Every structure is written in structure tokens, then in C-alpha cells.
């Protein structure tokens, strides 16, 4: 969840944000209410504003359908999907503002370092709120220019490295890291960007490379939830999987973390208020994690029944 901007005055105003996960999309669906005003580009798009008269999930895709009477920018429908920007204008209740903070405290960005390199020259910067902030430079048979660059990247301390630049210097550098610095190389990626220095960092940001990194960090957390569920299944300790088991555990509000496959929600919402389960888990301090069957974590989850939970205590007894 990205919060592009807000101008709240006395808890009322506009908040412009971007959902980055199905979790986000799911929360926005209950945040946006009939009566509010939503701005989004639609269609040469045009970005309209509508006084929401209905909010609902699509049936055959992860999309939030928001419809109402055009107000700014007749009637129109805005379809919200992950990665799309939208502005919600209303009087905000503390619950929603809280959920938004949590959503944000869920999409934290790792310390990212960008390195543009070309024969005999390199410049690195770290990502900060205002943009890329240069951290060092290095200028040029035996090069060993690489070793010097690598040593200072290693001393700056970060988790992900974006390596860009003209030609193959960037490529050979990564190989250099794969051999001399395996731990740094495992979290480094080479992008097609040719620019260098300031120009380069700007292009990197334009290509949404960072957005992809975040995307991987999220999928990595889902796999970790699948591993915990598995270890729990192995130890036969504090876990439930399958709707029946989960409902049983929920009866005692033993759900710490509810894991659910997007396909599951779609199929179930047709038969019962599956979303009520999710609201109830959270209302009880539980966390909801919606995984997309488009990736591996959600596929595994489906294999186990499409829905599982990490418990606060056993309940089989």
C-alpha cells in the first residue's frame, strides 16, 4: 500500500494511494463506502470522480468494482486493481486510518542501493524518500576496479542491489560478485538501463524496478507463511487447514494468522459471506494474508484446501 498524498483536515479530506497486494485491495473494498468520492483514471483515459453508490469485488478476477454518479472530471464505474492509483475523499474514521497505517507497515521497502557502472567508472546511491542519494563514486588487463566498488558497496549496508549501466560492465560485475561476494550477489539484479549516474537512477525509478523488488519481498513472506504452516503440520502443532478446520479454530478465536488463496475467496463468496470470516479474524487481532494462485505460495495453499491458519493454541482437544 503506497500513500501518494493526503490533505486531511479534521480527519476529512482526500487520500491518494495505490494498493500493491490483494490484502490492500481487499481492505480498500471495505474502506471505500457508499457516499464517498473516488477519483481514478478510466476510459485516452480521463480520470473521473464518482460519488460511490456501490462497491463490490469482481467474480472472475481480482478487481474491485466501484460505481456511482459522476461528480467531477452521468454515471460511471471505476475498476480498481493492484498497482493502480486512486483517490478516496471522505470523512475518515479512526479504524480506516489505522488499517491504512498497518497496510503501510506491511509494505515496508528494504534498504535499496543502485549502482550504475561502465568501464572504469561507477556511481552508487541509496533510495530515500526524496529520491536516490549518491553514496560513492569510483574511477578506473587487470581492472580490480570491481573489487574496490564491491568493497564499498559491502561497507554501506543494504539488502538489495540494482546494477545498471551501458554494455557489459554491469554483467561482468555481477559475475564478480557471484564469485567474490555470494551473499551480496544473491540479492542483486542487473537491469537493461543504459544511463549512468543521476540519469540512470531516474530511469531505474521509471522502470518500476523497485516495485518488482517489493513484489518479490512479498512473495518471499508468503512462502515463509507456507513453511510455517508446513512445519506446524509436521509437528502437528498450532495449525488448521481446510475451511472446516479453520472455522473450528475460529470458533475459539484461535487464529493468529489466517492464510487464504485468492481463488478460494472467489469461489466461496458465491456461497456465503466468506469476507465476514476475514473481518472477524482481524477484529480479534488476527492478521489476514491473501495469496494469489498466480504464484507458487498460493498454489501450495490451494493444495491444502485453499485456506489455512497459524493458531495461538491447539483446538483439536
UniProtKB/Swiss-Prot annotation:
Its EC number is 3.1.-.-. GO terms for molecular function: endonuclease activity; metal ion binding. SMART domains: eRF1_1 (SM01194). It comes from the Archaea. Its main location: cytoplasm. One of its GO terms (cellular component) is cytoplasm. Keywords: Cytoplasm, Endonuclease, Hydrolase, Metal-binding, Nuclease. InterPro entries: eFR1_2_sf, eRF1_1_Pelota, eRF1_2, eRF1_3, Pelota/DOM34_N, Pelota_arc, Ribosomal_eL30-like_sf, Transl-rel_pelota. It is found in: Cytoplasm. Gene3D superfamilies: 3.30.1330.30, eRF1 domain 2 (3.30.420.60), Pelota, domain A (2.30.30.870). Its cofactor is a divalent metal cation. GO terms for biological process: nonfunctional rRNA decay; nuclear-transcribed mRNA catabolic process, no-go decay; nuclear-transcribed mRNA catabolic process, non-stop decay; ribosome disassembly; RNA surveillance. May function in recognizing stalled ribosomes, interact with stem-loop structures in stalled mRNA molecules, and effect endonucleolytic cleavage of the mRNA. May play a role in the release non-functional ribosomes and degradation of damaged mRNAs. Has endoribonuclease activity. Monomer. Belongs to the eukaryotic release factor 1 family. Pelota subfamily. The N-terminal domain has the RNA-binding Sm fold. It harbors the endoribonuclease activity. This is Protein pelota homolog. It comes from Archaeoglobus fulgidus (strain ATCC 49558 / DSM 4304 / JCM 9628 / NBRC 100126 / VC-16).
Amino acid at each position: 500500500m503506497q500513500i501518494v498524498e493526503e490533505n486531511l483536515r479534521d480527519n476529512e479530506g482526500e487520500i491518494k494511494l495505490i494498493p500493491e497486494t490483494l490484502d490492500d485491495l481487499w481492505h480498500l473494498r471495505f474502506i471505500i463506502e457508499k457516499g464517498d468520492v473516488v477519483f481514478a483514471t478510466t476510459k485516452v483515459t480521463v480520470r473521473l470522480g464518482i460519488e460511490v453508490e456501490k462497491v463490490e469485488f469482481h467474480r472472475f478476477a481480482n478487481r474491485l468494482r466501484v460505481s456511482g454518479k459522476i461528480v467531477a472530471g452521468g454515471y460511471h464505474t471505476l475498476n480498481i486493481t493492484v498497482g493502480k492509483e486512486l483517490s478516496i475523499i471522505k470523512k475518515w474514521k479512526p479504524e480506516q486510518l489505522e488499517r491504512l497505517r498497518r497496510a503501510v507497515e506491511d509494505s515496508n521497502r528494504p534498504e535499496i542501493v543502485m549502482l550504475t557502472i561502465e568501464e572504469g567508472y561507477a556511481v552508487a546511491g541509496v533510495l530515500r524518500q526524496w529520491g536516490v542519494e549518491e553514496i560513492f563514486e569510483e574511477r578506473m588487463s587487470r581492472k580490480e576496479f570491481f573489487g574496490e566498488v564491491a568493497a564499498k558497496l559491502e561497507s554501506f549496508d543494504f539488502k538489495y542491489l540494482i546494477v545498471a549501466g551501458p554494455g557489459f560492465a554491469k554483467n561482468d560485475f555481477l559475475d564478480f560478485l557471484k564469485e567474490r561476494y555470494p551473499e551480496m550477489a544473491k540479492n542483486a539484479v542487473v537491469v537493461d538501463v543504459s544511463s549512468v549516474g543521476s540519469r540512470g537512477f531516474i530511469e531505474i525509478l521509471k522502470r518500476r524496478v523497485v516495485d518488482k523488488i517489493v513484489g518479490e519481498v512479498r512473495l518471499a513472506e508468503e512462502a515463509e507463511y507456507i513453511d510455517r504452516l508446513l512445519e506446524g503440520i509436521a509437528k502437528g502443532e498450532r495449525v488448521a487447514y481446510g475451511l472446516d478446520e479453520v472455522r473450528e479454530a475460529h470458533n475459539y478465536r484461535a487464529i493468529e494468522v489466517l492464510l487464504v488463496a485468492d481463488e478460494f475467496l472467489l469461489e466461496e463468496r458465491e456461497k456465503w459471506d466468506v469476507d465476514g470470516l476475514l473481518r472477524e479474524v482481524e477484529e480479534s487481532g488476527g492478521k489476514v494474508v491473501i495469496m494469489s494462485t498466480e504464484f507458487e505460495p498460493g498454489k501450495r495453499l490451494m493444495s491444502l484446501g485453499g485456506i489455512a491458519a497459524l493458531l495461538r493454541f491447539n483446538v483439536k482437544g
